Design an enzyme around this catalytic site. Sequence first.
Site, PDB file in Angstrom:
ATOM      1  N   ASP A   1     114.848  -3.182  -0.310  1.00 21.56           N
ATOM      2  CA  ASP A   1     114.259  -3.387  -1.644  1.00 21.56           C
ATOM      3  C   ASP A   1     112.722  -3.394  -1.618  1.00 21.56           C
ATOM      4  OD1 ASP A   1     116.934  -3.595  -2.466  1.00 21.56           O
ATOM      5  OD2 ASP A   1     116.867  -5.781  -2.653  1.00 21.56           O
TER       6      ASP A   1
ATOM      7  N   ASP B   1     126.003  -3.471   1.450  1.00 26.51           N
ATOM      8  CA  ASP B   1     124.743  -4.108   1.089  1.00 26.51           C
ATOM      9  C   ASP B   1     124.644  -5.518   1.681  1.00 26.51           C
ATOM     10  OD1 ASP B   1     122.220  -4.440  -0.219  1.00 26.51           O
ATOM     11  OD2 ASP B   1     123.018  -4.014  -2.207  1.00 26.51           O
TER      12      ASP B   1
ATOM     13  N   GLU C   1     122.252  -8.583   6.253  1.00 23.98           N
ATOM     14  CA  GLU C   1     121.394  -9.314   7.186  1.00 23.98           C
ATOM     15  C   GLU C   1     122.069 -10.495   7.896  1.00 23.98           C
ATOM     16  OE1 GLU C   1     119.097  -6.812   4.555  1.00 23.98           O
ATOM     17  OE2 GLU C   1     120.467  -8.441   4.058  1.00 23.98           O
TER      18      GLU C   1
END
Length: 920
Positions: free
Chosen positions: A603, A527, A530
């Site tokens: 998300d 997760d 980025e």
Amino acid sequence: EVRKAADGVTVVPSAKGAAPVRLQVVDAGIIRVSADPDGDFARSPSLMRVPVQGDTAFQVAEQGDSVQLKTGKVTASISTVDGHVSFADANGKPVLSEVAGGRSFAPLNVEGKQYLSVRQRFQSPDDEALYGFGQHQQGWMNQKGRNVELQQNNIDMAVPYLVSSRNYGLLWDNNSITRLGDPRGLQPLPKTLTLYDAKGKAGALTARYAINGKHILERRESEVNYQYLSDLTKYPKKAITKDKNSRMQVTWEGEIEVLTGGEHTFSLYSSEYAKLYVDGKLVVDRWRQNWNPWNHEFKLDLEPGQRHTVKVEWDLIDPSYIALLHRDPLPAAEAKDLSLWSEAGQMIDYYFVSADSYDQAVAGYRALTGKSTMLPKWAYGFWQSRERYKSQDELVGAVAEYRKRKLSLDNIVLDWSYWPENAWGSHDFDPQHFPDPDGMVKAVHDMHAQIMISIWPKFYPTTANYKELDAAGFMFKRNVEVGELDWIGKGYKNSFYDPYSEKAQAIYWRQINEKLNSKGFDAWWMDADEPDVHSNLDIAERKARTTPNALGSSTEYFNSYPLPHTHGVYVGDRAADDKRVFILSRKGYAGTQRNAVAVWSGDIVSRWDDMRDQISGGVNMALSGLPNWTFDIGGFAVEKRYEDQDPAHLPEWRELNTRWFQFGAFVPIFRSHGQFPYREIWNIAPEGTPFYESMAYYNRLRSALLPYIYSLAGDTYQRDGVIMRGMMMDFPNDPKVRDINDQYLFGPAFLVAPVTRFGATSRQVYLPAGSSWLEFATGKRYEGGQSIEAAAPIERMPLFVRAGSIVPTGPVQEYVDQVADAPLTVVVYTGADGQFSLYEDDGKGYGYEKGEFSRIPLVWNQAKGELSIGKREGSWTGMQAKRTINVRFVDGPRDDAGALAPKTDASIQYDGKPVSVLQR
Ligand SMILES: [K+]
């Protein structure tokens, strides 16, 4: 000057200011173009490239103003005046040309280094369609004429590979922030607009601030800008409330007037509730969760001397974000070009891929950046997740209840915060809630399920694992130096590690191997890569908190973080035992498919708009080159009416999740996840409702379609293929499928048209021209090249099967291989010739790399009415040497169309030798 090399040519153009240009033949249909003002072509070593075994032969001809390089597939011409490159195919037909004088280089001085910001322009006709360049959130299928910025974000994914309807692809090998279209990006509102406030006074709009609908203050503002954390300091302090109830509102009102005429584009970047009216017409009407704002683009044709009213209405909680930004038209000489721009690099460097089909364009990407690793077969079954199972009893109980209800479930997921609260990065377990993690894993495995666990790149400075990475020089320091607190409890200092060095990858994996892999976890949920160091920082701060890395600056490498990060876990997990790796990463990039990485769209929210947007996002993701992709069924974050389980909004909550579940059953990876309410089938709605009936049906249908689905997965590696297909891939000569943004193909057989409107019981569906189509639920036949009103009751999604499709199927299974030596049912949808080579292997290890797989050719001849089952080739550990094969023909309406256990029409024993089955 013209200089010949073993693999190409370099030209120094005669014009002043034109850059030296070098062509290299990578393969007969893949040509590298590099252009460098200095003439040395020095760049940082590519991260996305892998070596290519190609035919590098070519011939050179030099005639007048041009130097020609010719392979068996391509002729590339270079101007000796300005160096511009033009490509033609085997027959001399023009395919793609650079603009003459179309290169730009500008200096960028940052982080102690010198870079060039570079731009390449290509000639582009009005009827060219463009796809790929990552996975985005505007709902655009076709990218022609669109502005698209590559900047890794939670819901916005960068992959710098583009595919064209003109039979080529382009790999743009640059790791920095990159722009298709306008090289300038989005501007503050007043930069190229004249403003007038609500009283007509020039120079600003009228801003009004409210708390709970009660006016606090009004002021003139020339910008609509609360985009990032650094912008919030200008929000009027008397208008802020941090009450648990209470909301805030802002409106902006006035008029705009452009300075040059044409097509103007805009973005309302926003979180929480945001509306925008232009000339009294509603053009944006959106909700996102407060901590994940994103761009909501629109466009208008506007002319100077004319005013247009604007009204922004924002309803928010502390903190939320908004900005209204603008692009004016480019100069006419530039506006129609295909333009690629990058913030930081050393030169222009790209690859031209000659492509007779969309499939071949994707295959060129896989040649250049790596084959897509096979994932475990169980990864193609149903995944259940939650944000978050708060104890091991909750997680194990969810698996047990799927088994009690005899529903299909292969994989269960443990999200964040299983660790002691103050110990993020330790990979330890809080014993209150997870007293026996080894027993948790064993209990899941004993119920024939796999378990994946969340691992972030994030560490608290009090942990031993942080201190080990920091002492070696592999922890970014700035986030802890400024004392930024995360959202957990009272707030904790934290930073993220630097993955670029192989020594950092070794330490990161070693910590995970000792603490987690030793306990038997099957898969890694990587997760926030980025990386998401602190949400809603401005870009300068994101850069400063991720720099320097082992190779250079985060300005040069802004988009490349997930590639080395996932690589380290792939190599360590593969070295630890002989099973196939599975990683789910929040970001992909060019090359991540070679590290056994699936990706998801992040998300997004429980809104019908977001559901619709994922259709074009998934198609463009596949044409960018990443074949294993998914999303959160139902959306990640939810409005208060859903979280509080207001009964007034329960019907819409159930209908949205049911429609999105239908859709998720037909994307490459099938996965339920999100924030409260709980998302298991029986927690969406109880048995007896149409919602439960529908989810159970598609859950079980997926398991019956596994032979078909897994054959496609085999060909992502064997044939450099995809799973989710844009309609233009198989119907490239039907112009009507180029822009449709809410239909796609699930493999070659299934046309999928999800329903994205509350209360719809049907929707319009365009059937591509050149084939007839069989409605999956009925067997009714429809000719191609028409739009129909397709039936879509709450419990069923429009689904049509291409004539000539051969679909291998099996029995409904509660988990992969539940019934050993299951019979295979080949379903033939008649109406045209067809073929399908059924790929099978052991589904578990890397034997396929050494040839351990089988292929059974299936061929349908429509004139003869004959299904030919060909000679089997290959073998693998556990293969059925002899097996039962049933055959079912769908040639029109049939009462059991779409049934989970339908009637078969013939049954034969197969031992690898060719056998024929006639419909007559
Ligand atoms: K392994």
